[PDB]
Write a protein that binds this DNA or RNA. Sequence first.
RNA 1: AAUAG
DNA 2: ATTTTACTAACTGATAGCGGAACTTTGGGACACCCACAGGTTACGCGAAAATGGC
DNA 3: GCCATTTTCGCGGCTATTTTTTTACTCCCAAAGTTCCGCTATCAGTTAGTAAAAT
Lengths: 205, 336, 69, 50, 123, 32, 100, 98
Amino acid sequence: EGNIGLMKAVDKFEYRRGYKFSTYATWWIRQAITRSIADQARTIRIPVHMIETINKLNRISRQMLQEMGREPLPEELAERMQMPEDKIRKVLKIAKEPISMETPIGDDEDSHLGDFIEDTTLELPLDSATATSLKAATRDVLAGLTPREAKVLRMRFGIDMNTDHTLEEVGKQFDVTRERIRQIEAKALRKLRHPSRSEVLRSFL
Amino acid sequence: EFDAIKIGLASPDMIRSWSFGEVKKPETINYRTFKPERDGLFCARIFGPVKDYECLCGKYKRLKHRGVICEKCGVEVTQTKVRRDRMGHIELASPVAHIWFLKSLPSRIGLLMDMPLRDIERVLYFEMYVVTEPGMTDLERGQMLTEEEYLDRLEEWGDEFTAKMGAEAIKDLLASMDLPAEAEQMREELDTTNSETKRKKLTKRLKLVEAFVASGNKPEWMILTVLPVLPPDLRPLVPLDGGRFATSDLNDLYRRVINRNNRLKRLLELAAPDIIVRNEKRMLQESVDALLDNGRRGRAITGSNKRPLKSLADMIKGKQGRFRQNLLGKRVDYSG
Amino acid sequence: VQDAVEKIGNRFDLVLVAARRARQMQSGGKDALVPEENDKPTVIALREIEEGLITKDVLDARERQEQQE
Amino acid sequence: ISAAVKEFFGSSQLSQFMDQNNPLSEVTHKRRISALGPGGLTRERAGFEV
Amino acid sequence: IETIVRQMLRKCTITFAGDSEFLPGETVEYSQVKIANRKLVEEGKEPARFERELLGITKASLATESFISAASFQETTRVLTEAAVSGKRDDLRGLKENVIVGRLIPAGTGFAYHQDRQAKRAQ
Amino acid sequence: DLARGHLVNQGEAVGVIAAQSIGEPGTQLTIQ
Amino acid sequence: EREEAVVWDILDEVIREHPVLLNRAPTLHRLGIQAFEPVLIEGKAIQLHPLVCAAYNADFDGDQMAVHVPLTLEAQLEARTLMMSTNNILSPASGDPIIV
Amino acid sequence: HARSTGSYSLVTQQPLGGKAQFGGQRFGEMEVWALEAYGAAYTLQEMLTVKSDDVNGRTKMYKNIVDGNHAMEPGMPESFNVLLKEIRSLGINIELED
RNA sequence: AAUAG
DNA sequence: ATTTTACTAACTGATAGCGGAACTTTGGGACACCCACAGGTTACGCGAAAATGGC
DNA sequence: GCCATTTTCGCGGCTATTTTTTTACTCCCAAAGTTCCGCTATCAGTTAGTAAAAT
Ligand SMILES: [Mg+2]
Ligand SMILES: [Zn+2]
């Protein structure tokens, strides 16, 4: 990166000014190296302005640690930075590098952190069985209804279908009537809400 | 379902066929939104959505749009487990030698090319030239030239010969080999040989050559031009409690490879002095070697924890490797 | 299970035949040919094999008869 | 300097979580001598004679 | 002990090439040579001549036909490199391969199962 | 088959049995 | 979760003839895993038959055992026919009795 | 300790380890050797696939047991897919033939 | 690392 | 004559779109002179096989 | 050109249970892309009211 900066410095040197090449080239080499550090030194990339904020926070915290003898609390750092304390806390927690999954846990040496990380995206088999049971119960309840109401509810909720449907295309079935489809859906819900045919589905709440 | 497992070399076309996209940036996730960055090591356009049946846009966000690629983002509406199966690729700016086929003794490249490993490393490390196309000249293929000698004979002959230096030279030497001709030559020389040492050498090399002919593999596939990239969910970057993140070392190794490749491309675009370009090519080779097998070439690359990074060879091998820890024995349910 | 291995000859073959019979009594609607005596399908199948009622050839013959019908 | 001292006092192999089942456990732990640790031997590499 | 010694005596070095597809001074499996010799005798042609070799249990394990078992044992890099350059094919005939791929082992209760497959591939 | 008393059956993994049989006692191991 | 009495009766009916696999590390030979019929006991410790201890190299000075439940019918019949302790009373290494 | 079903690993998709994590016992190499010596192929396949890392198979097995069917439909362990992916990432074409 | 078998 | 229900219109919330200014983010530049680095390490041991050296 | 000697390479038991780590640091500016609050406007759903019908 310093070599690239040096080439850029050679591209724009001016010997008429009388200064020597090191004087001008040092600035460009420094800039190239430090921009490269700002852009490529972290697994999660931090923008350059936040990198400067973090570095100057570290410098101020080190000067205050020398000054008072104990770690500077966030409000004192905020007052010295002329920035809000919430911004200080933001900068503080976004300035931590990711931990390795090969790091041992506790005092062990054959243990690794990655061996203790769950898969939170998985679905519990109890939940899958409950979903299958709910599907079966809903099918049985729908079987106790008039075929028109069962089909209307199926289209309006997407049961056994790829997509859900609004009142317009449900009306498009036989009679394109939003107010009618709405009434028959209400009737179907009222009959399904009767305690005679709802004790099976009540257990799933 | 399947009756056998077949192993062999991977061609650049095969590696491209495995890939669902090209990783162009070393970016992983945004530092505020924690969303994958485009063309990065965790791109959803390459490896798949981060939520089931959603796109990074949030526009297509149900099963009604399954299999539809969002025009704003490019993320396919499918499941998230596809991020455990979808691979990517990196188009290397310069060819890189594969460390297993170079330093796992005996060296396959050296055995095939009948040149000592030290000479091969000298050509690779940009210390010595080698003749690729001798032309109408007394020069022979595989003969080493120093920079002084190369300049001398470049003035002497000109464009009659081609001499190269690096992994491109080894790839050109391996691509120009006539395998059936070599097999016939070793058979003829074995017919009229008496020494048992030379007999052993020619029988080993003949076995390698006829194995290459029979397998359909090409020798130049031992030099990498396209580098495969593992699925992100096998090298996860997952949040811990308190905002901390746990990552795999493969992300560090891949980021090093991508950064050095991009710097090589930028140096070649700037028409840099040859010393800088040679340095960058050495560093690219070192980074790829560290990614594949850390510690085989030399000093093992270490992370911030001052310990060597774990590479793919370490993933698959050893007492703590995948074969013995997870395949020949497992943790089981319904146990106490 | 000495009687069962004597009637079959091979322990692995006995395991396979008893598994088929137990699946017939559990997943299928087939009924036991011996008093159940509050026993699980595996033990019922083993008892049937010991009594000589169930063999591999008998199972194949009954499957062929079911296919014919 | 603080990093060095915290490293030694919290992450060293010889800085051990105190045994505190009973008074004897504490006394024995404080009077314990290890051949391991930084600059010492290793379990697998140690031989019969030592 | 005799079973272990049998697994120790599994390779042969060919001394006479004959007409079979074997080179002199080549260490190959004995069963392959025996099958080839039976075929050539059925064809009435010169059989191969071999000297049997005794290998240690580690070397014999590393020199098996299947690269899955050899890689799972030790020296994974060497085994995988040799298999990759050679272009080897693993038929999954032993216990370790079928354990790794999740299939029934070709022993005991699974034995018959595998036999059935060997019939279907034959047909 | 020593564990069963009769002739060995087809499909018996005798190599694993041999290896375990040899390996298990390894701890006990040190002219008229 | 509420541990009703009918749950205990159901548990008895479930384990009535379901064999369970007992294991002790290190498993130096195949007699380190054997199948038993479980008898439900009040307590937190597994009760092991004395005559099998020599097979397990197990003594009651702090030893711990692992337990596995065969699920499918084939696994249950394998536990009953092959791995059951009454089948394995001879040493596969020598043929001598192991339950002495 | 006892467990029937619980948390699983992020990469290997295998049950976690430890009483603190409600994990499962490890069926190591020597246990597999014991099962091979017995000849219990189906018990071993249960341990390898539907109890550890066959994601679809283990859910199907739980549903079957809840339905009182006691049958399994084994599949490919996820650890083998991971192994295939890493070997491919090492620039080596490893594949399954039918 | 320490501890139990 | 009264009660239940079906029809219809109005309210309201969600939502897609847009404006625009603040906010985050990226790329360029800096002219006394400065001109070859680490950088801890290791008391292993054993057997094989592979690479060097001897005449 | 084979016979011996030195140099790498890979290996060293299985199950459990207790527990995170820690150095190193410029600034400013102009230009560009993105976000966050507020407002609009449309559609669909919900709800209240009233007439139509039935008891
Ligand atoms: Mg004890
Ligand atoms: Zn989108």
